[PDB]
Every structure is written in C-alpha cells, then in structure tokens.
Amino acid sequence: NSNAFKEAVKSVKTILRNLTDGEITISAYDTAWVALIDAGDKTPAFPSAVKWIAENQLSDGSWGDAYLFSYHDRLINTLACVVALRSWNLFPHQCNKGITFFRENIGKLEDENDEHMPIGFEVAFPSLLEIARGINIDVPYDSPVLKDIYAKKELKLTRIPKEIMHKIPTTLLHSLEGMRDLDWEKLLKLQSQDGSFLFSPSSTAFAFMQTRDSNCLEYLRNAVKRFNGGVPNVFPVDLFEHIWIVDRLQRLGISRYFEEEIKECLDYVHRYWTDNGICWARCSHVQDIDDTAMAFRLLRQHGYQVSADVFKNFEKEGEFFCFVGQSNQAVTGMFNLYRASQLAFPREEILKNAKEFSYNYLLEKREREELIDKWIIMKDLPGEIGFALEIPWYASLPRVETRFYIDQYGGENDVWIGKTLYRMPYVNNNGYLELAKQDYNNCQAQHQLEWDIFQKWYEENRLSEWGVRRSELLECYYLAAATIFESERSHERMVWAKSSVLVKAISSSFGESSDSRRSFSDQFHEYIANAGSVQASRLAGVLIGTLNQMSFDLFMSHGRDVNNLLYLSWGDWMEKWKLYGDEGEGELMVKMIILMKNNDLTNFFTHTHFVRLAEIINRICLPEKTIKSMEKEMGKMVELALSESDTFRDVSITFLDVAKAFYYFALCGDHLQTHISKVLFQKVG
Numbered sequence: 001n002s003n004a005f006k007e008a009v010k011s012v013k014t015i016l017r018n019l020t021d022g023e024i025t026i027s028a029y030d031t032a033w034v035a036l037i038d039a040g041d042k043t044p045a046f047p048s049a050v051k052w053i054a055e056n057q058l059s060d061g062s063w064g065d066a067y068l069f070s071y072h073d074r075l076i077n078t079l080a081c082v083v084a085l086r087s088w089n090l091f092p093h094q095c096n097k098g099i100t101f102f103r104e105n106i107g108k109l110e111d112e113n114d115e116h117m118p119i120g121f122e123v124a125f126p127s128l129l130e131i132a133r134g135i136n137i138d139v140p141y142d143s144p145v146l147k148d149i150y151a152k153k154e155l156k157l158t159r160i161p162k163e164i165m166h167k168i169p170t171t172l173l174h175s176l177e178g179m180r181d182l183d184w185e186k187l188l189k190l191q192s193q194d195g196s197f198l199f200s201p202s203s204t205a206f207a208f209m210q211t212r213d214s215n216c217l218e219y220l221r222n223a224v225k226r227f228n229g230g231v232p233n234v235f236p237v238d239l240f241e242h243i244w245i246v247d248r249l250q251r252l253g254i255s256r257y258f259e260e261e262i263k264e265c266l267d268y269v270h271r272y273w274t275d276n277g278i279c280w281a282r283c284s285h286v287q288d289i290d291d292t293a294m295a296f297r298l299l300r301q302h303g304y305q306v307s308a309d310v311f312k313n314f315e316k317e318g319e320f321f322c323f324v325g326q327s328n329q330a331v332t333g334m335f336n337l338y339r340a341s342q343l344a345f346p347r348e349e350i351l352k353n354a355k356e357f358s359y360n361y362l363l364e365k366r367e368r369e370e371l372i373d374k375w376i377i378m379k380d381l382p383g384e385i386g387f388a389l390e391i392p393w394y395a396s397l398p399r400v401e402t403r404f405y406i407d408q409y410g411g412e413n414d415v416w417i418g419k420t421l422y423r424m425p426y427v428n429n430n431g432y433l434e435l436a437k438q439d440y441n442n443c444q445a446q447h448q449l450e451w452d453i454f455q456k457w458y459e460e461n462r463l464s465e466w467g468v469r470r471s472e473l474l475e476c477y478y479l480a481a482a483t484i485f486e487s488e489r490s491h492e493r494m495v496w497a498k499s500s501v502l503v504k505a506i507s508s509s510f511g512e513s514s515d516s517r518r519s520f521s522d523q524f525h526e527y528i529a530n531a532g533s534v535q536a537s538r539l540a541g542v543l544i545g546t547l548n549q550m551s552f553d554l555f556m557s558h559g560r561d562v563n564n565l566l567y568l569s570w571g572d573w574m575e576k577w578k579l580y581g582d583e584g585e586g587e588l589m590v591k592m593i594i595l596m597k598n599n600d601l602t603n604f605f606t607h608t609h610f611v612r613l614a615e616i617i618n619r620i621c622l623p624e625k626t627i628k629s630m631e632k633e634m635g636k637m638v639e640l641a642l643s644e645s646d647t648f649r650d651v652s653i654t655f656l657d658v659a660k661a662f663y664y665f666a667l668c669g670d671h672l673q674t675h676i677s678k679v680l681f682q683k684v685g
Ligand SMILES: C=C1CC[C@H]2C(C)(C)CCC[C@]2(C)[C@H]1CCN(C)CCOP(=O)(O)OP(=O)(O)O
Pocket: 673, 674, 676, 677, 681, 682
C-alpha cells in the first residue's frame, strides 16, 4: 500500500469521524426565503443570508447548480433571489443582472420535460411571481407559458386535503410557501421537535413570517449558523447521510479499512432508531420506507437487534408506500425495501409480503423501461437494480456485487432533486471511486498471482488424474477469492480453494462403493499413524502433503501450530462421508478457514451455536425443488449467524460466506464465464 493511498484512507476517516447534520449544498431558493424575513424594524433578520445571495451568483446572472443546468432549477432560484434582494432595495447590479436572466430565459421553461421537476414547483413558482408583481419587478407576467402555470397551481391546490393537512403530520408540511389561507392555530401543533416544518428552511421561514413563532426562529438560526450564511433545502439530513455513506463504502468494497468509524456511524443511527422507523432526520413525526429500509438492513446485518414490525406502518392491502398514509411510491424506496426484505428471519411474514411486492413492482417497472427515479439523477439506476433482480442477496458474493457497483457508482456527478438541485459530497464523492478502483485492482492483481501458483499446484500433483477437471479448478478458486478477497487473507482463501479441490478428488476417485470409501479412509488414518489400497495411499499422500504445507506456512507467519486439528477435521468429514455419499462438505470448509485465521478461534468448535450452525450448513451443501429447500435452510442460518455477540461473530459470518458461495453456485454455476471474467481478469477502468 503506497502513501497516496494511505493518505486517502486517512482523509475518508476524518470525514466519517466528523459527520454532523449533513454535508449538503446551499439552496439559493431556501436562503432567499430566509432572507425575506423582517427582524421587526424593516431590516433583514438574517443579514448573512442576504450576503450569501449577493456573492454566489453564477456569471450568466442566475443562481442554482453550477455544473448542471436545469431551467426549472435556475428559474425558481433566481426569481427568489431577485425578490429577496429587491424587497430590501439592496445590491442593484446583481439584482438587475438577475432579472435580465429571468426575462431572457422564462420562455425556455415551456419545453423542458416535467420528468425531472422539483418538489412543489407548480405551487411555489406562481407564489414568488405574485410577490414579485407586487413590488414592481419588470417581468413577463402575461407570457404564454406563465398564465399556464398560474392555472396548474389552482388545479393542484384543489387536490390538497386541507382538512387532513391541518390535523395530522404529512409531507405537505415541507411545502407551505405556496398555500393560501392556512390555520396557523392548528399548524403550529404539527411543528417538529427542532421547531421546523418537516426540516425545510424555506417552509419554516415562511411560517415564521406569518406567526413570528419563537421556535421556527431558533431552528432557522441554527441552520444559518451551520452553513455560514446560506441554508440547504433540507436540514438536518443526518440519518440519511450516516446510512448512505456506510452503504456506499460497503458496496464499493472498501468497507474494511474503516471498520471502527463505521461502528460509530451505525451506533449513532441506532441511537435515533424507533419502532415506527426513521426518516432522513433525527426526531421526526414523519417517516419514510426508504430511509427506514436502509437503516433496518444495515443494522440487522451488523448484529443490532431491530424489528420487522417497523414496516407495518407503510403497508395497506398488501402494498407498501414511501410515506405513512400517502399514496407515494418511488423506485429507489422500493429498491431498498427489496434489499431489506431479504434479511427476513423465518418468522417475519411482513417481510415475505414486502419481498413479493417490491419484487413485482421493480419487475414490471423494468418491463416498461420505467426504472428511473424522478427525484434523483444517477449514473446507472437500471443497472444497480438489474443486478439485484438477478442476483439475490443469498447469492451475492462481496467481489461480484462490488465489481458491478464500481462501474455504476456516479460519484460526484449524482444529483438529488428536492425543491432545488443539491449534491451530497460525502455520499457522492469521486475520492471514494478512485480509492475503490485502486483497491479493487490491487486485490485482483494478487488473485492473478495466486491463480498461477494454484494451477502449478494442480499440475504438480497430477490432480487431473484424480478426477478434478480444469473447470472445477477455476470454479473452486473463483468462489474462494470472490468471498475472501483481502490480500492479507491469502491463508484462509487458499486453504478453502485447495480443500474443495481435494474433496472433489477424493469423492470422484473413491466415493463409489460403500467400502471403497472405507478403503480411502483407512489409508488416510494409516498414513496418519507414523508419529486398490495402493491407489488410495497415493491420493492420501497428496492430501497430507497439502495439509502439512499449509499448517507450516501458517506457523511460519504467526507461530500457531494447527497441524493436528487439520487432520482431525478431515477425519471427521470422512467418518461422515464413509457411510453415505458426499455429505458434510460444508462444515469442513468452515473449519479450514477458521483454523487459518490470524488469531485463534478453535475454542468455539465445541459451542452449541457452532454445532447448530454446522448442523444446517450440511443440509444446504450436497451433490429447482432443492434450490427452494436451500433458501428454507439458509433462512434458519441467517437469524443464527447475525444475532451474535461480537466474539463469536467472525465464526458465524464465515458460515454465511460458505453458504452463500454454495447457493450462488447452485444458481449461476451453469454460466459463470462473464462474472469470473469481470471479477478476476478485467481491471476496473
Ligand atoms: C482469455 C480468456 C478466455 C477464457 C475465459 C474463461 C476461461 C471463460 C474465463 C473468463 C476469462 C477468460 C480467462 C478470458 C479472459 C481474458 N481476459 C484477459 C479478457 C480478454 O482479454 P483479451 O484476450 O486480451 O481481449 P481484450 O478483452 O480486448 O483485452
């Protein structure tokens, strides 16, 4: 590992250590609504917001996202800023440059498609127009395209459930700037614990203008401080940020470098977890299935005890929804629900239904090319989801998922759509992409070495004459490396790849008759005690030779002597195999891997939990109706494997790793040449 790299890791660590209320971009629109606020004496309550606007104008006269031009974005941002500037009679030059932009550009809005269109635009846009008309700003109010949105507003305003909106919490509280006669009597009772209206600085700034409420003021005051002048279009965004950074780091395959920092993150998220789920911000009376599903999964997969009853709230009539009691469905929310529902323990019927539903939703959405999210612009959503649709979590191996995700991750070019456009530099980062591209290529270089060495070994012991095909050789190595890929873990990887090749040699050479097995087992135990049968003795020598090479290699590195335990474990497999066909092959791979771990864990081979696990892994692994029986079994394994105190964890996971490898092979074994190719033989980039 070079120094540029070592430094990149430090930086990412200083980010994770310093996560706060969210690293989000300023929203010219939202900071213009904050800047419209009267202290009480006809002066801006928030000077710094007025100042931000005067100093962050793009050179073509507009405000908004500088690297992605959207007529919807730039028009609503500039209008708001010009209004803010003009009603304090401040900064004439920039204000004028701003109106010129708006005039020359309002005509183009009529032709951009409403496919990527901001939240509450048809309502919030005419509202500014009015404010502007009533301060004598010279803009085309008649404009063929304008009298058109004035209309869409009034018609959008009649779909609104005014009754409900005032009685119970809904997402509408986020977009109040556009609405008319509101009962602030009833609305203030729907305020959030931080004094905002659904964590929106513009909506809250509006409410304060109308109520002079002291809590809305406190919230706006913290926002203005946090971002040194400007404000985002959502705040806080802390839960969302924690959960998304973790998810990206794990998918990009570089999660292990930051194991400790990631634990602080999930710790923070568990702190503000609730029985109703969560939303993007801590302490909310509103929750969404997207944030909740991402948290549920990341938590359960890391041994936090969370409950699936959390999903009861988003379901009606066997369907699931983004927000409680709203009819909103989004592609990315269902996607994250589908990923979460696969971590279902055998008792959770709510998650069986969640899986079945989110599967079809995404399935149909695919067969209509409608796999795009209106709310977010990503490099490759259809790709991410295609992978999840064909490679179930039970069959997803670290290196395979990661290999595909590094090509899909958009880095800094991903753009989120709220009321304006905004970016999340700590979730969508080019730095993470380069780090991941460099790390992935290094481990792959290392696997290419081990694979040449591994071929030589296969030739030198003439394993081809023992019934092991070159196809099996590569498949045995690929599964080992696609699962345990870290360069610092060659021992566990190699022992796995070799042990599997050898169980294949022994099984195809001596597994036919009910005593030819005995013959080999006897030969093995004779070969042991020196501290037809001719043939058996030669194979046994290959096994023993390989066993000795590895336990000594280990002892060379760590000073552990595991030789006897290696033999014992292979003898146990035979006692079992001797009676029937190829039986407990699964349990044996787990023991090998464990025995080659840099630290000692043999203590646990005795524990009931290890025994119970071993009992299941062996019912998964055996020489369409069976694929089903596999999920059944694996279901029993997932509960047991994850719900573990963190001493035993490294054992339980290892069980999962092996089981996944088998399932994956049962599901894809027939055509693996594409995966193998991309994973082992094609550098990223
Ligand atoms: C040489 C290969 C043939 C057989 C194949 C399987 C045995 C089916 C397993 C997947 C990879 C691979 C090894 C495969 C990959 C070779 N890899 C370097 C990828 C192909 O490389 P190339 O021949 O130089 O052409 P290029 O893509 O334009 O650069």
